Amino acid sequence: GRGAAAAILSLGNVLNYLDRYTVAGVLLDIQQHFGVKDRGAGLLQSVFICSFMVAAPIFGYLGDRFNRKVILSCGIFFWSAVTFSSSFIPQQYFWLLVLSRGLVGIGEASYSTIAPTIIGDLFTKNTRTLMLSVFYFAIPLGSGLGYITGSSVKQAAGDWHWALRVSPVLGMITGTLILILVPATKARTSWLRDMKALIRNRSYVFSSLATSAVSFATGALGMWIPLYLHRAQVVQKTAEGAKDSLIFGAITCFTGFLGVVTGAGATRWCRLKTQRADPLVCAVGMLGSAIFICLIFVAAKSSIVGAYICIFVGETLLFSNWAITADILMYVVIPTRRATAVALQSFTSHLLGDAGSPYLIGFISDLIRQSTKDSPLWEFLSLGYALMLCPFVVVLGGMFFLATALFFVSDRARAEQQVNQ
Amino acid sequence: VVPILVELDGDVNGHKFSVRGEGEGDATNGKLTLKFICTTGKLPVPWPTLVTTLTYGVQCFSRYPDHMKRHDFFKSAMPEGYVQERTISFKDDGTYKTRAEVKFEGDTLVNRIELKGIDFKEDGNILGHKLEYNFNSHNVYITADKQKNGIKANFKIRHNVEDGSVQLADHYQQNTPIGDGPVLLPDNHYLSTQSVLSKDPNEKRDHMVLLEFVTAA
Amino acid sequence: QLVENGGGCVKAGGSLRLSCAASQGTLSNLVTGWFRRAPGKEREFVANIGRDGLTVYSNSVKGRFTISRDRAKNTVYLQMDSLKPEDTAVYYCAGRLSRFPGEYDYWSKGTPVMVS
Amino acid sequence: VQLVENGGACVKPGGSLRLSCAASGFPVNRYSMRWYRQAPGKEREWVAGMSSAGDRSSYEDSVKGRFTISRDDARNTVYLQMNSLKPEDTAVYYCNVNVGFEYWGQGTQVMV
């Protein structure tokens, strides 16, 4: 029934994020086998996210044009087949891998744009909010399971190719369940005027920039943490990499859950005390996250457990702010312009950050390594120096959240005024 | 555009009168243009009292919003027709009991009404023909009932009088679909009706050229 | 259902403390708002009190009306100062279950108000 | 065609106020004028009427002999006199006249 449909959709999202972040686990093996530098490592995620963000609006318009179920199932099968084919790529050819990543990004954008509409249409009662909460609870679980599955497959099979072979098998399966348990669900000038109106909103623009910085930091760290930890292990006398990715994925999922819960609790507690609570809690949490992401670099060389606890706290703080910033957004904007504002914010977040951010980090690391000598310690130092940019971006995002705090009450009062008329 | 031909009969205090009329309705434009005529030499009661009943007897032509298209019941039962029972209690001027049958026969709509009048007294507005030729727009509230598996409509109609008196008559209506197809009964809605009247001087016979615009919400 | 009371015609500059309450239950959680409809003009806004504790007023009437919610009495009081002829519109009290901008689910009959 | 109402203000018990309804676009004398009264959250009820010929006026029992409405064709306006003021007058008023398709006036609100 409808509950079974929601469960299968949640499993599909779990597998979607699994395949999104599987590449992060075996990035080291991919770069070693393909003989590419850190720039090539960045290319994958950069082009993937660019295609995702470029394609999402088209998928919204398709959802308007055609039924959601057919598009969702077609995207499932398409990107599952693409991921399966990408596993069998000649070592000489590398552009095929980035093309496959872009196609998978197209499919993932289709899923992310269509599935929420189906979830909303299945239920129109209190259970709809619970199902959406389950979806957003599965997203971090999906990313985790991706990291853990990639690491485990690499360790067991002994080849990184199998990491991209097991998951598609699980994917296509759930696709067949989509059409089995999910019943079928049942302007340009206006959008241009809306867009023209939103840019004049100071709080909304500042929140969009801050979440763009959040996306930048999240993408860069989630992409380069495993490689950085492996480099730290190699530099030290004793070295492992599958266990490191396993621990990182477990910490990532647990951090997602704990950070979401703690951010909800903290913003609820602070809102009752004084106004502008959500932006302030966002800013303080991100400042702490930046402090710990700066301390991780000092801690890693001393010990890897210090770096892991730093990742723990930083992921908690950086994932606790998403619900609060979404609440700020949908506070500021009026109901007639929520959809356009949300789409614009997502596009801006992907474009400014998390798209071209992994490539930026890889390019910085490659430049540092080329300027200096080439060796394990040099590679580790170059990667660390490249990652030192993320704390600055997180601090800038915190400043943006503070500025949004400045323009929060006035913009909310306005929004209410335009709502009344 | 859809043609319509409505023939009805009515007995009031022993006076029998039959009225036949023809016209056309545009559902897309939400417009209705009708013209009636009584074969009998004279019609006892004032014409508006029956013109309102004839107008509200058909609501398939009435345009519905896009969101209310699936909510409509009369169109859903249109292929197999339906039967309506209306009680019209006039204020101090008696009561009307009408039974109507609506069906799309062949390629044209057909509407047959049988009317009974009761509790009429001399010197009243109905007996004295004091009601003028003007009309008024109105609102009808429709709600579904699962026990009767049908739709019940109710409202108040204000009839004008020459001396300025206004009579508020209560209209209640119960529907029953002749066919056994899906009902698609709406939970609750209200339809606003706007009626205008005109006469054609070409013929001495009274024409009662009637124009309706009905919109649901 | 929301019950509103305390509105009557007064001289220019008079003060009216309009009281609004809910029959279903306590409205401390619910966001409350006051609206006005002119006889010859489109409906406008009077004021709003959100769940956080803000008291937002329309720019035209800013600095005139003051809303205060009391949890002990579970009632919303709208005190008026420097009342002007522009406030001849009829006032309606409405409530919402959500903190966020949007149309209020509940409504009240309201009372007329006049000036001069 | 348009109808405009004026003269409405709150009245202390016993006071007498005059309401006025004017028309623009059609001759008022050619057709009958009517006056409705409705309270907050109450069904509309006909409160007064004057025949098109103007020979007599129709009023309900509660208010028979109070409104004493008059009409001026040269002035193209109909005037209403409260006379004795009762709590039932707290309801707001409306001026109505139907030429061709019906037309509803904006009316005015009056409360005791």
Author numbering:
A (entry chain A): 100 to 285, 298 to 351, 359 to 539
B (entry chain B): 11 to 227
C (entry chain C): 3 to 118
D (entry chain D): 2 to 52, 52A, 53 to 82, 82A, 82B, 82C, 83 to 109
Original authors' sentences:
Here, we show that a generic and kinetically biased ‘Gembody’ (Gb) interface, previously discovered through trapping in crystallo, can also be trapped in solution by kinetically controlled side-chain-to-side-chain bond formation in a manner that leads to ready generation of complexes; these display ideally balanced interface flexibility and yet relative complex constraints, in turn allowing rapid cryo-EM structure determination, even of small targets. Ultimately, after a survey of in-solution covalent bond-forming methods exploring differing natural and unnatural amino acid residues, we found that Cu(II)-catalyzed oxidation at a pivotal C12 residue site (together with the presence of needed Gb ‘gem’ substitutions previously discovered through iterative X-ray-guided engineering) offered a route to direct and rapid, high-yielding formation of disulfide-linked homo Di-Gembody (homoDiGb) without side reactions (for example, off-site oxidation) to form a robust covalent interface. In summary, our plug-and-play DiGb strategy improves cryo-EM resolvability and resolution of small proteins through constraint and increased particle size with a simple and robust workflow and can even enable simultaneous structure determination of two challenging targets in one dataset.
Next we explored bi-specificity of this tool, by testing the extension of our modular DiGb method to the more challenging generation of heteroDiGbs. In an essentially identical workflow using heteroDiGb GbC4:GbEnhancer, the SPNS2:heteroDiGb:sfGFP complex structure was determined to 3.90 Å overall, with 2.84 Å for SPNS2 and 3.75 Å for sfGFP, individually. For membrane protein SPNS2, we used ~9.0 mg ml−1 for the homoDiGb complex and ~4.0 mg ml−1 for the heteroDiGb complexes. HeteroDiGbs, in particular, enable varied partner Gbs and target proteins that will likely dramatically change the chemical and physical properties of the complex and, thus, its behavior on the cryo-EM grid.
